[PDB]
Amino acid sequence: PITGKVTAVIGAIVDVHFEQSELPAILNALEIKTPQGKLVLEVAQHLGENTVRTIAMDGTEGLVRGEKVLDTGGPISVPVGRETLGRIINVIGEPIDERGPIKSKLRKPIHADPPSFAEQSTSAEILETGIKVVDLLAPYARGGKIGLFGGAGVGKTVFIQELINNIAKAHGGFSVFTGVGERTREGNDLYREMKETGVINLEGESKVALVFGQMNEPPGARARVALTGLTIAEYFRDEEGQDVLLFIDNIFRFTQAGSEVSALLGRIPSAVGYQPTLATDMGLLQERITTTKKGSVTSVQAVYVPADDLTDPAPATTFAHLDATTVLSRGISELGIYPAVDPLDSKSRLLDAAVVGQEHYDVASKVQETLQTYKSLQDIIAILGMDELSEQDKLTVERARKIQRFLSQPFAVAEVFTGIPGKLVRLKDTVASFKAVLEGKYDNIPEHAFYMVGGIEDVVAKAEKLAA
Template sequence: KGRVLSGLGDPIDGQGPLRTTTTYPVMNQPPSPLSRKRITEALPVGVKAIDGLITVGKGQRMGILAGSGVGKSTLMGMIARNTEADINVIALIGERGREVRDFLERDLGEKGLKRSVVIVATSDQPALVRIKGAFVATSIAEYFRDQGLDVLLLMDSLTRFALAQREVGLATGEPPATRGYTPSVFALLPRLLERAGNSQKGTITGLYTVLVEGDDMNEPITDAVRGIVDGHIALSRNLAAMNIYPAIDVLNSISRVMIDIVPPTQMQAANRFRSLLATYQDASDLIDIGAYKKGANPKIDEALNHIDGLYEFLRQDIYEDALFEDTINHLHQSVGEQVVS
C-alpha cells in the first residue's frame, strides 16, 4: 500500500524495491460465472449523488463517462479518499506526465495514497506498456481480492487503453473498423473488464473512466463499455457550466444492481428525485423566459418548489466526505419526505 508503480509493475516512487515473493499472472482468467457471488451489498463511496441515486455495489463495474475537462479525475480523487473499500488500486493509463503528480498530491492526497497502490503508464510510453499497465493493475487488485479484501479498482482512462490497442492493431496489419478502432480493441475490452467483480474470497469494484470523444455518448468505445459494465455515471458539461460539481447527470446515469442493494424507501426517494428533476428540466425553457405561470401544471409547481433542494443535494465540496447515512437522510429531505430516525 502507498506505492507508485510503472506500467510493468516496477516501483517509480524512490522508496526502494517491493518486498514480496508472490507472483500473479498479468493475463489472468476472469472468475467462472457460477463461482461469482451475487452483488447484494452497497459500497459507499462518499459522494452524495452516487451513494443516494446511483448506488454502487461491492463487485460492480461502473463506467464514468465524460468529455474532457468536466471533472473525471477530481471525482476519482474524491472516491479514492472517501470510499469504504479496504484498499484502492488506481491505474493512470495514458495520462499526461504533469497530471500524475497533480493527481497524487492534490486529488488523492496523503489520506488517499496511504491505502492505495497506483500504477502509472503515461502517454509518452509505448502502447504495449500502456496496455500492460491496465492488466498489471487488475492483477494487483485480484491479489488483494484473494486476501479476502473489498478492493476498489479505479482506471483512468479506458479510452487511452483502447487507443493503445488500436495503435498495436494497426501496426500488426489489422483493418481499421469503426472510427479507426481495430477489431482487437473490442475483443480486449471484455477480457479486461470481466476480471473485476466478486469471487468466493473477496470483491473488486471497478470504476473505469471513458473520455467521450466530442461529447458524443454513442461513440464506439463509450457504446462498447456501456454494454459490458453494470451501470454508468455520466458527467454533464451543462451542470459543470452551472457550477454544480461533481457534474453528475443523474438522469442519464444508472446502476443496474441498485434495486438489489438498497432498501425500497431509498429506491422510492431516488425515483422521486429523478422525476422532479426531469419535470423541471423539461419545463426549464418556459420557466427561464417567464412564460410559465404558477398553478398551470401541478407537477411543474412541485418541481419548482423542490429544485433548490435537488441541486443542493447534487453539489458537494471536493474535500467533503459524505457519510452514507447522512446522504440518505439528505436525499429524503431534498424530495420533501419525512426522515425517520
C-alpha cells in the same frame, strides 16, 4: 539457462531464435540486458523453427542482432500486496517513484484467468459511496464497472479523490489507480494532487497504489499496463479480502493500444483499423473485474470517447461492460454542486427496485420526477413565474430547489482545499433523509439550509444556525 538470440528487430517486433530446443511458452516474458536497460519482450507467437516472435514492452533502440535473450520463465510478474501502496510502478513492475525498491513479498504473473461462472457471486449488491447524489440517483454497483463520463475541469480528479477517501473510510479498502496511456502532464498533476489531498501520505499508509503508463512507452507497454494494474487489484481482492477501487483512466487507451499491438503483430486490419481480437481483449480485461466470494474489485472507468463519436467500435465495445454512468457536468458545477454529478443524466442499471429496494426505487423515481418537472418547468418559470404554475406544482418547484441544494454534499478531500467538513451520509440515512424532504417535513426551512450539508439532522442544525 534457456537463452536465445535476437535475429530480427523490426519496429517493436523482436524475433528471438532459441537454439535450446525447449522454447519459452506463449505469454512468457523474455528479458534482454541492455546497457541502461532491461528490455522485457513478451512471447506473442511461436513461429516455429524454435523462433518465437515477441512484442517489446520497453524501447528497441540500439539492439544488436545476436543479443543474448534470457527467458524469465513465466509471464511478467509484478510485485503485489500492501507494500505496493503509495508507489508508482511501471509496467515491468519496477518502481518509477524513485523511492527505492518496493521490497514486496509475492510477485504475480500479469496474465491471470478471470474467475469461473460458479465462482462469481450470484447476487447484485450496491457499493455505498456515501456521496449523496451518487448513492441516491446513480447508485454504484458493488464490484461492477462504473463509467465516468466527463473530461477534466468538471472536478474529475477531485471526484476520484473523494471516492478514494470515502471507500477508505466506509469499506476500509485500498485503491489502485491505473493510468492507462495517460498524458504525462496529467499524471504529474495527479500525483501531486494525491499527495496534497493526502490519499498518498508519504509517511504512513497510502489509500491508493499508482501504476502509471505514460503514452511515451511503446505500444506493447501501453497495452499490457492495464493488466499489471489489474493484477494488483486481484491480490487485494483475493488475498486481502477487500472491496477494491480500480480507477482505469481511460478505457479508450486500452482499445487504442490493442489496435496498435495487433497491427504490429500483422493481423489483417479489422474495421476502422481496430484489432480483430477486439472482443477477447476487452473480455480479458472486464471479466477479471468482478465480485467473487473473496471480495470485489469495483472499477471506476473513465471514458474519453474519440472525436466525441461514441458509436465507434471502441466506445461500443466499452459500453458493453459499463453498469452505470456518472455524468460530471459543467452545467451542474455552475449550480455549485459538489460533486457535479448530473442527477438526471447519471444512470445506473442497478437503479431498479430489485436492487435498491422498492422503497429506495420509489423515492428515487419520485426524486427523478421532482427534479425533472422543475428542469422543464423552469422554462415556463423563466417566462411567467412559478406563481402561474399551480400551488402544488409550485411546491414541487420550491422543493426541487431544496432537493438540488440537498444533493450537494461537502467533500472530505475538499477539507484540505475549501475547508468544508466532509459528510459521508450512509446509504440508509441518505434514502431516509431525502424521503423526509419528499414527505415535505423539511419543506419549511430555508433552501440555503440544504446547501452543502450532510444528513437531514444537519439540514436542521444548519437551519437553526441560519436563523441564529
